[PDB]
């Protein structure tokens, strides 16, 4: 009956935790001892992208590690040449209420989504000189919080309808829909092999999903408040989260639990974006205290701040070659830190 | 210079995009952003039907001031994760049905929504245009059913003028910042036209009281 099902869910969660704590042979923070710390390293800004006129909510790097895309509330999807601070494109969005943007791994396509519950896919390399919508991916019953291009034809979107969904650009329909996530999903991060993806929601739980199978493979809990951002380790077997609970937690896929809590007593603001540097030795976390804290991802200490923003940092991401990290913020400014 | 014949024109493209973005941002800065809120089925659509799925953005022009109102009540998500998008709105057009004081109570749910948005950290310094509408149903409901059948804390009688003004004073009393922001309360019905004038007249007071605060004048 109903009593057994609640008891079964309670005993299964206890059974998951019983096996989870048994595998905790040694914490990663204790394991990473007698190692050389990264140290206080200053990463001064190199280029300041100064085109946006409203709060920037998302940015993404091209796989060439030079092209950049960014979305703000002035109804603009600016494409940056980060090397020379040049505007490659500026796309007028029909709905200025966007909370995410994405760059295709190929580079031909750029996505954006937000409060209009629609993922708009923009074709950059058209025969015409303008940037036009390929297919608007309507079908979500909540705000679109994050989106990431799988291929030129596949993109999985994290929405405010408490569900994630993998789409298909050719047909415009969700090939699979990822359900079972109580509370609305606020961010997602595709794997380097583009096979699995995790997603952070307002249940303070990060769930790993199989893209093809459509099944929630694993659940990661431990955050006290809602998760605003997530990011895979470059290896693809681990990921770090960013939550309003004011700590970043590194979850391992195989270990199926936490590794560290990147928490400081002097910091109470909630993380808005999280990005792993190449080799995963540095974690770039975009905090809400007008600053990004560069966390040495293998230790519990901080590798330094970069600051340089007059408002809350809302988006940041390192390049695909690790050359630089761009940190957008609500002050309509993008700074390339290196 | 050390600029190629194509890097010179790539810079020219960037310079010419900035001229388009400045022109787009100067046009977007003259559009008044209003965040429409209030409980569902509380006369919200009434104060939109006089002029001109997630956000139902509504644009209406009044006295050479381009407005832009965001009917956001269709989100049905955790509002704490997308209400920060509406920083810098001129006012919050809150719509509360007066007749919904007894239909578990809509007024208590609507009063709780006013608490959650007047005391919000993102809206600590923006005004609220409270719209106590559907007085026509409120008039017939007060005469047929006294307010003491649902509200025993009321001291006044079951009249109209003192009962309606009681809800006005019971809704501008939850502002934890009585001086940083001002609730501009209006009374409207279905057969009314001055509601759009009240929104234009209120935001002019919002703009000026921000303009005076800009150049240290008030």
């Amino acid at each position: 009956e109903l009593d057994q099902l609640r008891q079964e869910a309670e005993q299964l969660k206890n059974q998951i935790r019983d096996a989870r704590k048994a595998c905790a042979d040694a914490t990663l923070s204790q394991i990473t001892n007698n190692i050389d710390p990264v140290g206080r390293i200053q990463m001064r800004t190199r280029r300041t992208l100064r085109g946006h006129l409203a709060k920037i909510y998302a940015m993404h790097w091209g796989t060439d590690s030079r092209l950049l895309v960014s979305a703000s509330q002035d109804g603009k999807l600016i494409i940056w040449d980060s090397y020379t601070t040049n505007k490659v494109h500026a796309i007028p969005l029909r709905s200025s209420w966007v909370m995410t943007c994405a760059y295709a791994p190929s580079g031909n396509y750029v996505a954006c989504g937000g409060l209009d519950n629609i993922c708009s896919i923009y074709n950059l390399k058209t025969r015409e000189g303008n940037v036009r919508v390929s297919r608007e991916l309507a079908g979500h019953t909540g705000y679109l919080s994050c989106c990431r291009f799988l291929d030129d034809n596949q993109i999985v979107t994290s929405s405010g309808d408490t569900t994630c969904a993998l789409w298909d650009i050719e047909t415009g329909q969700q090939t699979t829909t990822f359900t079972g996530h109580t509370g609305d999903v606020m961010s997602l991060s595709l794997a380097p092999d583009t096979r699995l993806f995790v997603s952070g929601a307002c249940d303070a739980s990060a769930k790993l999903w199989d893209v093809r199978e459509g099944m929630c493979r694993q659940t990661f809990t431990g955050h006290e408040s809602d998760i605003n951002a997530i990011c895979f380790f470059p290896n693809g077997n681990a990921f770090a989260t960013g939550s309003d609970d004011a700590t970043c937690r590194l979850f391992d896929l195989r270990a199926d639990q936490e590794l560290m809590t990147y928490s400081h007593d002097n910091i109470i603001c909630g993380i808005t974006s999280v990005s792993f540097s190449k080799s995963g030795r540095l974690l770039l976390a975009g905090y809400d205290d007008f600053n990004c804290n560069v966390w040495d991802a293998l230790k519990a200490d901080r590798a330094g701040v970069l600051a340089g923003h007059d408002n809350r940092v809302s988006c940041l991401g390192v390049t695909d070659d690790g050359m630089a990290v761009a940190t957008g913020s609500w002050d309509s400014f993008l700074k390339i830190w290196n | 210079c050390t600029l190629s014949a194509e890097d010179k024109a790539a810079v020219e493209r960037s310079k010419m995009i900035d001229r388009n973005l400045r022109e787009d941002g100067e046009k977007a800065a003259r559009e008044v952003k209003l965040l429409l809120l209030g409980a569902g089925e509380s006369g919200k659509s009434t104060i939109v039907k006089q002029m001109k799925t997630g956000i139902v953005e509504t644009h209406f022009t009044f006295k050479d001031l381009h407005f832009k109102m965001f009917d956001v009540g269709a989100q049905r998500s955790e509002r704490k994760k997308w209400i920060h998008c509406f920083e810098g709105v001129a006012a919050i057009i809150f719509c509360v049905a007066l007749s919904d004081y007894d239909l578990m109570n809509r007024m208590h749910e609507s009063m709780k929504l006013f608490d959650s948005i007047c005391n919000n950290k993102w809206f600590t310094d923006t005004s609220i245009i409270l719209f106590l509408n559907k007085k026509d149903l409120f008039e017939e409901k007060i005469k047929k059913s006294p307010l003491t059948i649902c509200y025993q804390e009321y001291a006044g009688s079951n009249t109209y003028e003192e009962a309606a003004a009681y809800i006005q004073c019971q809704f501008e009393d939850l502002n934890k910042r009585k001086d940083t922001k001002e609730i501009y309360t209006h009374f409207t019905c279905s057969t009314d036209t001055k509601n759009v004038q009240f929104v234009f007249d209120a935001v002019t007071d919002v703009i000026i009281k921000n303009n005076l605060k800009d150049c240290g004048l008030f």
Epitope: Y83, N86, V88, G129 | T2, S4, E6, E12
Partner: single-chain antibody, 232 residues
């Protein structure tokens, strides 16, 4: 995507003739337009370049001053006004579009151009190969010679490879050292380094034959190579 160039014809010496291009099918207002001439017996020769929004305007040193260029962004129309048409202006003036951003492919689409007839510092681009005979299905690697290195400090080598098939407007093949254009087969492969430049084809069909033109874009004025006419 088309560029219907209008005007032109038989013009008396010393007169003027307004050349117009009816650009359509694309976002013309963000395209830096060009003009490329071609004598009936000689090779291509660049004429002018008006950037987007009627910005920076360049001219060839041969016809600078007496050639004045203009564009009409709302009408999607590109004009070229020239006065005192000498005996050396009996060339076919092609109209080219070109956009400049990172990863862009300038000179990608060329208009069919107009025929003009009259009554009667720079980087040198030379290709000693001409009237090259080759059978289809083989591999041909023609070469183009530059006066100096086209490789820049940023790392972009502004060499361009075109293909004027017999009786048709030129078509871009390789818009950099090796950057293959969009809409052309993968068989084409430009190469070379520094001053020496070459364009290689894996196998050639009966279609990709004609005269191949090499062109620099390092700085203005832009100079084309001579006629490298592939023969079947």
């Amino acid at each position: 995507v088309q560029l219907v160039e209008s005007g032109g014809g038989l013009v008396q010496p010393g007169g003027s003739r307004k050349l117009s291009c009816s650009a359509s099918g694309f976002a013309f207002s963000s395209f830096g337009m060009h003009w490329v001439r071609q004598a009936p017996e000689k090779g291509l020769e660049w004429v002018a370049y008006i950037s987007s929004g009627s910005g920076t305007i360049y001219y060839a040193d041969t016809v600078k001053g007496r050639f004045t260029i203009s564009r009409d962004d709302p009408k999607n129309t590109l004009f070229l006004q020239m006065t005192s048409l000498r005996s050396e202006d009996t060339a076919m003036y092609y109209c080219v579009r070109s956009i400049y951003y990172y990863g862009s492919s300038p000179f990608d689409f060329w208009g069919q151009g107009t025929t003009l007839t009259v009554s009667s510092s720079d980087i040198v681009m030379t290709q000693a190969t001409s009237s090259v005979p080759v059978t289809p299905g083989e591999s041909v690697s023609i070469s183009c010679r530059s006066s100096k290195s086209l490789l820049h400090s940023n790392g972009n080598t502004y060499l361009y490879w075109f293909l004027q098939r017999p009786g048709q407007s030129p078509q871009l093949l390789i818009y950099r050292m090796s950057n293959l254009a969009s809409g052309v087969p993968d068989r084409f492969s430009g190469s070379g380094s520094g001053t020496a430049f070459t364009l290689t084809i894996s196998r050639l069909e009966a279609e990709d034959v004609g005269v191949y033109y090499c062109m620099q874009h390092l700085e203005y004025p832009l100079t084309f190579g001579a006629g490298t006419k592939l023969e079947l």
